[PDB]
From Swiss-Prot, chain A:
Signal peptide: none annotated. GO terms for molecular function: rRNA binding; structural constituent of ribosome. GO terms for cellular component: 90S preribosome; cytosol; cytosolic small ribosomal subunit. It is found in: Cytoplasm. This is Small ribosomal subunit protein uS17A. It comes from Saccharomyces cerevisiae (strain ATCC 204508 / S288c). The gene is RPS11A. There are 2 genes for uS17 in yeast.
Swiss-Prot record, chain B:
The chain holds residues 459 to 500 of 534 of the full protein. This is Protein BFR2. It comes from Saccharomyces cerevisiae (strain ATCC 204508 / S288c) (Baker's yeast). Present with 15400 molecules/cell in log phase SD medium. It is found in: Nucleus, Nucleolus. Belongs to the AATF family. Induction: Up-regulated during cold stress and following nutrient replenishment by dilution of cells fron exhausted to fresh minimal medium. It comes from the Eukaryota. Involved in endoplasmic reticulum to Golgi transport. Involved in a protein-transport step blocked by brefeldin A, which disrupts the Golgi apparatus and its incoming protein flux. May also be involved for mass growth or cell proliferation. The gene is BFR2.
From Swiss-Prot, chain F:
Component of the ribosome, a large ribonucleoprotein complex responsible for the synthesis of proteins in the cell. The small ribosomal subunit (SSU) binds messenger RNAs (mRNAs) and translates the encoded message by selecting cognate aminoacyl-transfer RNA (tRNA) molecules. The large subunit (LSU) contains the ribosomal catalytic site termed the peptidyl transferase center (PTC), which catalyzes the formation of peptide bonds, thereby polymerizing the amino acids delivered by tRNAs into a polypeptide chain. The gene is RPS4A. CDD domains: KOW_RPS4, S4. It is found in: Cytoplasm. This is Small ribosomal subunit protein eS4A.
UniProtKB/Swiss-Prot annotation, chain G:
The gene is RPS8A. The modification Phosphoserine is found at residues 65, 68, 72, 85, 131-132, 135, 138. Keywords: Cytoplasm, Phosphoprotein, Ribonucleoprotein, Ribosomal protein. Disulfide bonds: none annotated. GO terms for molecular function: structural constituent of ribosome. This is Small ribosomal subunit protein eS8A. The modification Phosphothreonine is found at residues 61, 106. GO terms for biological process: maturation of SSU-rRNA from tricistronic rRNA transcript (SSU-rRNA, 5.8S rRNA, LSU-rRNA); translation. Component of the ribosome, a large ribonucleoprotein complex responsible for the synthesis of proteins in the cell. The small ribosomal subunit (SSU) binds messenger RNAs (mRNAs) and translates the encoded message by selecting cognate aminoacyl-transfer RNA (tRNA) molecules. The large subunit (LSU) contains the ribosomal catalytic site termed the peptidyl transferase center (PTC), which catalyzes the formation of peptide bonds, thereby polymerizing the amino acids delivered by tRNAs into a polypeptide chain. Component of the small ribosomal subunit (SSU). Mature yeast ribosomes consist of a small (40S) and a large (60S) subunit. The 40S small subunit contains 1 molecule of ribosomal RNA (18S rRNA) and 33 different proteins (encoded by 57 genes). The large 60S subunit contains 3 rRNA molecules (25S, 5.8S and 5S rRNA) and 46 different proteins (encoded by 81 genes). Coiled coil: none annotated. It is found in: Cytoplasm.
Length: 140, 42, 354, 41, 355, 245, 177
RNA sequence: AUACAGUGAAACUGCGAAUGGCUCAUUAAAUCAGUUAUCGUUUAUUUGAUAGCAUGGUAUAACUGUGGUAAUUCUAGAGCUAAUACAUGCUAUCUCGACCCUUUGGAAGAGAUUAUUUAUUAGAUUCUUCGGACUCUUGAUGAUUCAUAAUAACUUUUCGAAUCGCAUGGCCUUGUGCUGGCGAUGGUUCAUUCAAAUUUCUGCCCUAUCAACUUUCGAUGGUAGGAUAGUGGCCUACCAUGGUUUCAACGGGUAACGGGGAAUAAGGGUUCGAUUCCGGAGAGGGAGCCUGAGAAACG
């Protein structure tokens, strides 16, 4: 469904003139994110409208690129990913088993499930808790 | 939701804001009750 | 400072000296680059609503640009003070006789509390606010919201007892009568309900009626008269019914004005008779007598009016509007000037010898 | 009061206007010539 | 008369079918003074962006109401102007007035009429006492100051040249905007005299590098069937001027293309009157002149439509003899030397129809 | 702090000004000007602590008000003018030109120069862009932006400019195997040959440099200032020539 | 005053913060400029930098553009018909970005009649306008969408709803009334 | 020196007064220390680029004189006059160039000729005179709806020198005709500088005689809107229930400002960290406004 809300979901400033009778009647815009990442076919030719999509929305990726594992997918277009690493602790000459859970916006183009390993990039702040946007999923 | 919920919650300052007040009735309600009865229903 | 009608002498003591189509901001810049009675009697953006304090010495008004309140004192004849709030306040009443406590239905779907010492805390209302009235024999702020709810707030409990039910999508005007302490609610679906406190029951429901063009009304005035027995309803076609207390027949049946909605009906206690003010967005305010039901006078400020009040003594009609000066009218034909502008009778002599 | 010094200042201002116009014109013309010879070569 | 509220007070009260609109008899009694104040509000110069925004406001003011307000406005404009010198004489001026004030009045007239033309493209009327008389007065006085005075008054000669060019382009615009609503035969002889004085004499050497308004006007003459009366009024003066432009080889392909468009139109348009046959034989001389062209002089649209001109020549056959058939096989070897990769199979089939 | 700061404590000065600690308590704040702040050298500390031509700030002010000390052909009159890297300071009665250039120890230093080398200047072309009427321009490091450059100039170039008028004399591209100057980093002040140029994605473009005593080290392209070609440095170096022992 | 920061909110680990400092000026929040239909009344504000930001509290005239033909004309406003913020604001006529409005049609009628000669309603291949907007032309009032921010510039410039968005919002209109 | 020119009180005007200085009550990622972004924004000044009427108006301070009053840095009446005050208003070049000509070119003609707000486009990935010719398929990053360019509109709406100092020249129809030196302030845009704003990853004192929490008044996001310089549950309208976890969350104790330091035992590392550097917060109470590039100032 492409019109699931009371506002006409469309990207800004794109205009398909009804004066020409072209076959491809819906014009879609995307962009090459680069950074050693690929623009997937479902993103570049899907029928979804997003602003926080890293490939079709108006948010660029810049800064730090992180890795995580999918824990819970029970919020729209956003997934919390879990960072697992070891801790610098001085007292007893060893590490400590620690973890960090990072809420990350996801585009609906990628297909995701619990436990997938994902690489993400920093993006400009969208909401109170989200700071990152995914750039590549990988199944496991 | 955000502020669209009516829940009967207790408020601190407004309970002692201005209450109580006067019984400024112009009548004794003994005629006004049967006046309600003898309103436009009858 | 002029006169509109011919047989009767009316007086706009403060108002735009330019009549129409030459806008007020360019007019004031032009005339300041090329006599008022109260110091700084203007807002220079707009104004919403007026309620004179019960003492008859404070004039509280709400205006729009950086939405604020002008508190004037008739003793000082200037701003007692000014105070900015967040959003454009729509409905307000001063709870006490002095201005020390004020409540206001605020357009951001909330209720706010203006005070002497400051500003007590805002409280949200679950639906969009339509009309708030203060019951003053049982301490109640009750507000008809957007649609089917009329929420209720007691000043001893602080909680909400129960929202009253009005089975329409709009709550266009609410009033309370204290001579007989009943609740009145008029809705633009040609429906008017009357409610009963101390027992929590609706007692009356009426007032389907059509105009000449067969259109539904929009009742914007649900008031009553000084006796607390006969009521007055008024809607968008310049249409004024004055009903009695318990009959289906209106006592007075009048049509006037235009398709522009009338905004306020108010009573006046003359020396021998009862009179009526209709105020309409036909930029008009007509002054009837109720026995004849006759427009004895009429005032045209040439620019629209959003609210009217009459001073409790005699003579003065405050009017809150969208213009630069909040404007007020003097009527010699009901009584003299009040105790504090006591030279306006001599200014009346001046305009008559002019 | 209108002075010959003021007329001197005014014609000096007009002279500076036409002078900077001429300088911009020569700069644009020489850049066009440079780009033309670079593109032909 | 006020300034800072102008365009919005216009779009409030003076718009018909709006609030506080002026009634019909009130329009009848107050509109002349409205014409005068809007004459001032058009006489305003657009030296700034806000000033030209108010000029675009007045150009949106004019074409809404009706015809007779604007017609009386143009008659008052001509009254500030005059044509009674040139039309109390035949084409003479008794008191020569080449003053900058006079030509400035003419230029302001040109500005206001081209503005109302551009905003009222189709529904504008042509009041005869307000367009032909002052426009030919303007361009005639332009030619008068062109030939009488020397090059000393460079201000006057420069503004005269701009006035003349604006006169050509506004005459072209009004002709292409009305088409054939009415017969111009009242002063058609006089406007054709103004046509035949400079243009057939010196049309090819001057207007050859880029397409001109005069050439577009003569294209419209050939395009619409009623505008042949100049050609049938003289001994084909504009036709031989067109032939001279075609014969000159320094003329650009973008100039010569629309000439052959008009040539296809005038060959396609039949009329059973005098001189039409000698006219189309002069267009056969134009075929003789286009014979070396199209590949050493003259563009996919161009080569397509000129080939269509050859196909139309074949289908109607207004030219038949062995002379034009040898010229046809010469044009055939030329156009078959010409390329085919940028062409369409249907156009090749039309080549086969010619063959 | 509420707004911008406008003073500079003595100990908080950059270390390579060699300002002593026991003269007062403050240090001069360099003006708003062409070059940077934290890596510059003001005229006041130039004419007092560097050249010993004056004793007090009042005498430096009297000198600059007599207008002798031209800078880049133009006359300065203010005391806290922030001279930086590759600058021209022109003393007309002491008959000297000075290229303010770096040394190996990191300290800014003078170089006595005659007019045939004062008349030009090497600037690190840093940011090329376009502007009004579609015209191109190029932004150097010293606040000098040149509209209408030669289109063969790219990002991270070196341009030699006229000083009197302001036209570009010529330009030098960024090729591996040239003579470069290192501006930042730990080992700023050395010259050698750049052997190659690796690239990162969104990171620092690190460069290896071999110096003429044939030793390798690592710098960064943000620090690299291209000076010239093999055996032909376009400016006269100070003695030491990037050989540190 | 109205603060724009976030330290008055709870944290992300189920925790409330403390007051960090007093509200500094560089995070200001002001009154929304809920513009109503009326005679044009705009206020000027001097904001950060030398910025002159204008808040229209009443506006009478808006600019609207045809995207299909590609023109633009200044025109009055009949009034709001739909806004996806709140239906009560649609009722109380709050002119806002991304709202639906009814506009008069006689200036575009004058434009089409002047440029074409064919009166709308009742170069035809260049005159084939949509049937819904031609019915709105014959009625005298067309539909449009407004998306100029009211309280950042004090202007109302939008585009006349053409086929796709016009059809979606006409379906929304018919589902509303 | 018969307009002033030297000297200069007062007053108007411009600029600054948000720098500096002082104390430690608070707060355990709140600031902070390191690192990064601004492809998420704003900046007076500096510096450098950058714009094709022989001069109009008033309205006043300063100042003279009448005053009331008990009076503060109290005012009123009456009489003057200036601006960088305030408000206003004006002034020929390029493209193709036939033709004449060869050098060096003009010469009629056809054409074009600052700031906003919206909408639409572009900016895309073989032959040899072995002596010689082409006879074919913007910049930017890791990327930007980018800079930029264009059209049509649009605006309660703009600067596009009505200034000032020294000297006084060049030409000649010797008119006071027309030019011309050095430099002080102003004005748009862009860059630079100085800053301000939010931010990415890690690092905090003790505690389970403290295992459960936000879920309302947003606590998690999305759709959409207003708010400033800008993203943003910043807040608001609809929907779902999201996240912390003994990997101790949450709050509870520090007479704890933090960072750097200093003393200290020959050693694990321990006590001030008040000092003299960098950051952080603050000066009747509370609320609301003010000017400015810059404040929630301490005025």
């Amino acid at each position: 469904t492409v019109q699931s809300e009371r506002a006409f979901q469309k990207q800004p400033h794109i205009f398909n003139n009804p004066k020409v009778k072209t076959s491809k009647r819906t014009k879609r815009w995307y962009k090459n994110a680069g950074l050693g990442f690929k623009t997937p076919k479902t993103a570049i030719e899907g029928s979804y409208i997003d602003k926080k999509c890293p490939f079709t929305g108006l948010v660029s990726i810049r800064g730090k690129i992180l890795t995580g594992t999918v824990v819970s997918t029970k919020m729209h277009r956003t997934i919390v990913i879990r960072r697992a690493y070891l801790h610098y602790i001085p007292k007893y000459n060893r590490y400590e088993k620690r973890h960090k859970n990072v809420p990350v916006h996801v585009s609906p183009a990628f297909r995701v499930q619990v436990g997938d390993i994902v690489t993400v990039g920093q993006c400009r702040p969208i909401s109170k808790t989200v700071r990152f946007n995914v750039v590549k999923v990988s199944a496991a | 939701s955000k502020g669209r919920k009516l829940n009967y919650s207790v408020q601190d300052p407004i309970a002692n804001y201005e209450a109580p007040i006067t019984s400024g009735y112009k009548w004794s309600d003994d005629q006004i009750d049967e006046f309600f009865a003898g309103l436009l229903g009858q | 400072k002029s006169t509109s009608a011919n047989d009767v002498s009316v007086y706009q003591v403060s108002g735009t000296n330019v009549s129409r189509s030459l806008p007020d901001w360019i007019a004031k810049k032009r005339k300041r680059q090329l006599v008022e009675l109260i110091q700084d009697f203007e807002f220079s953006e707009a104004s919403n609503k007026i309620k004179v304090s019960r003492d008859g010495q404070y004039c509280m008004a709400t205006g729009t640009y950086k939405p604020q309140i002008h508190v004037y004192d008739f003793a000082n004849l200037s701003l007692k003070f000014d105070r900015h709030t967040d959003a454009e306040n729509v409905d307000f009443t001063i709870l006490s006789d002095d201005w020390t406590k004020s409540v206001h239905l605020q357009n951001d779907r909330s209720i706010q509390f203006q005070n002497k010492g400051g500003l007590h805390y805002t409280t949200r209302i679950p639906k969009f606010g339509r009309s708030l009235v203060y019951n003053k024999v049982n301490c109640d702020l009750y507000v008809g919201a957007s649609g089917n709810e009329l929420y209720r707030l007691n000043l001893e409990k602080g909680r909400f007892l129960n929202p009253f039910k009005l089975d329409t999508e709009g709550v266009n005007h609410v009033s309370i009568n204290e001579v007989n302490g009943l609740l009145a609610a008029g809705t633009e679906t040609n429906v008017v309900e009357f409610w009963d406190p101390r027992s929590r029951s609706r007692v009356s429901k009426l007032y389907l009626e059509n105009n000449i063009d067969n259109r539904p009304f929009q009742v914007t005035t649900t008031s009553f008269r000084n006796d607390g027995l006969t009521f007055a309803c008024g809607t968008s076609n310049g249409y004024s019914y004055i009903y009695d207390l318990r009959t289906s027949e209106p006592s007075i049946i009048k049509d006037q004005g235009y398709g522009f909605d009338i905004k306020k009906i108010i009573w006046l206690d003359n020396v021998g008779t009862e009179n009526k003010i209709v105020t309409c967005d036909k930029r008009i305010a007509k002054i009837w007598d109720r026995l004849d039901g006759k427009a004895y006078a009429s005032m045209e400020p040439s620019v629209d009016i959003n609210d009217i009040e009459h001073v409790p003594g005699t003579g003065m009609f405050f009017t809150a509007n969208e213009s630069i000066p909040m404007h007020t009218y003097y009527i010699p034909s009901l009584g003299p000037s009040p105790r504090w502008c006591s030279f306006l009778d001599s200014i009346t002599e001046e305009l008559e010898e002019k | 009061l209108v002075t010959p010094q003021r007329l001197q200042r005014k014609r000096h201002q007009r002279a500076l206007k036409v002078r900077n116009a001429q300088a911009q014109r020569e700069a644009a013309a020489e850049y066009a010539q440079l780009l033309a010879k670079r593109l032909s070569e | 008369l006020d300034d800072t509220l102008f365009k919005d007070e216009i779009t409030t009260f003076l718009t018909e079918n709006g609030s506080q609109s002026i009634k019909a008899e009130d329009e009848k009694v107050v509109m002349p003074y409205v014409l005068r104040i809007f004459f001032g509000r058009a006489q305003v110069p657009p030296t700034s962006g806000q000033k030209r925004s108010r000029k675009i406001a007045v150009i949106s003011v004019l074409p809404n109401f009706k015809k007779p307000y604007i017609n009386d406005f143009l008659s008052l404009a001509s009254e500030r102007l005059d044509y009674n010198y040139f039309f109390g004489n035949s084409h003479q001026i008794n008191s020569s007035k080449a003053t900058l004030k006079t030509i400035r009045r003419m230029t302001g007239f040109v500005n206001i009429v081209n503005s109302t033309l551009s905003v009222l493209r189709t529904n504008f009327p042509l009041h005869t006492n307000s367009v032909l008389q002052p426009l030919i007065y303007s361009i005639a006085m332009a030619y008068y100051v062109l030939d009488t005075e020397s090059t000393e008054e460079v201000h006057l000669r420069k503004m005269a040249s701009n006035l003349r060019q604006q006169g050509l382009k506004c005459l072209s615009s009004v002709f292409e905007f009305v088409g054939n609503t009415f017969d111009w035969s009242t002063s058609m002889e006089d406007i054709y005299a103004v046509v035949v004085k400079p243009r057939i004499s010196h049309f090819s050497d001057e207007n050859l590098q880029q397409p001109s308004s005069l050439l577009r006007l003569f294209l419209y003459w050939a395009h619409n069937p009623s505008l042949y009366q100049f050609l049938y009024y003289d001994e084909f003066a504009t036709a031989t001027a067109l032939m001279d432009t075609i014969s000159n080889q320094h003329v650009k392909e973008a100039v010569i293309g629309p000439i052959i468009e008009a040539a296809d139109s005038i060959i396609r348009n039949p009329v059973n009157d005098d001189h039409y046959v000698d006219l189309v034989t002069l267009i056969c001389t134009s075929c003789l002149k286009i014979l070396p062209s199209l590949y050493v002089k003259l563009d996919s649209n161009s080569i397509s439509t000129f080939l269509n001109l050859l196909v139309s020549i074949t289908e109607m056959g207004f030219i038949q003899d062995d002379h034009v058939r040898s010229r046809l096989i010469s044009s055939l070897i030329s156009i078959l030397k010409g390329k085919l990769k940028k062409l369409q199979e249907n156009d090749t089939q039309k080549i086969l129809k010619i063959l | 702090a509420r707004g911008p700061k406008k003073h500079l404590k003595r100990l908080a000065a950059p270390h390579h000004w060699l300002l002593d600690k026991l003269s007062g308590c403050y240090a001069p704040r360099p003006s708003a000007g062409p070059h940077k702040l934290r890596e510059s050298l003001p005229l006041i500390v130039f004419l007092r602590n560097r050249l010993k031509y004056a004793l007090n700030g009042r005498e430096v002010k009297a000198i600059l008000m007599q207008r002798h000390v031209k800078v880049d052909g133009k006359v300065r009159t203010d005391t806290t003018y922030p001279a930086g890297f590759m600058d021209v300071i022109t003393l007309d009665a002491t008959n000297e030109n000075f290229r303010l250039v770096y040394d190996v120890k990191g300290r800014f230093a003078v170089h006595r120069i005659t007019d045939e080398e004062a008349s030009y200047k090497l600037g690190k072309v840093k940011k090329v862009q376009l502007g009004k009427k579609g015209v191109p321009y190029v932004v150097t490091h010293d606040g000098r932006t040149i509209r209408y450059p030669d289109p063969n100039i790219k990002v991270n170039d070196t341009v030699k400019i006229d000083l009197a008028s302001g036209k570009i004399t010529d330009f030098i591209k960024f090729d591996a195997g040239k003579l470069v100057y290192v501006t930042g980093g730990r080992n700023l002040g050395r010259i050698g040959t750049i052997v190659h140029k690796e690239r990162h994605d969104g990171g620092f473009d690190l460069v290896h440099i071999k110096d003429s005593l044939d030793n390798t080290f690592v710098t960064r392209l943000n620090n690299v200032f291209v000076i010239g070609e093999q055996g032909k440095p376009y400016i006269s170096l100070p003695k030491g020539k990037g050989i540190k022992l | 005053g109205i603060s724009r920061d976030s330290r008055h909110k709870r944290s992300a680990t189920g925790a409330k913060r403390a007051q960090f400092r007093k509200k500094r000026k560089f995070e200001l929040g002001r009154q929304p400029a809920n513009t109503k239909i009326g005679a044009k009344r705009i206020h000027s504000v001097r904001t950060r930098g030398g910025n002159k930001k204008y808040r229209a509290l009443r506006i009478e005239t808006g600019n609207f553009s045809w995207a299909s033909e590609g023109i633009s004309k200044k025109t009055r406003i009949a009034g709001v018909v739909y806004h996806p913020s709140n239906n009560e604001l649609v009722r109380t006529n709050t002119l806002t970005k991304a709202a639906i409005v009814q506009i008069d049609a006689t200036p575009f009628r004058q434009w089409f009649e002047a440029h074409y000669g064919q009166t709308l309603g009742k170069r035809a291949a260049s005159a084939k306008i949509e049937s819904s907007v031609e019915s709105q032309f014959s009625a005298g009032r067309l539909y449009a969408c407004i998306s100029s921010r009211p309280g950042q510039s004090g202007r109302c410039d939008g585009y006349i709803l053409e086929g796709e968005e016009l059809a979606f919002y006409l379906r929304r209109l018919t589902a509303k009334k």
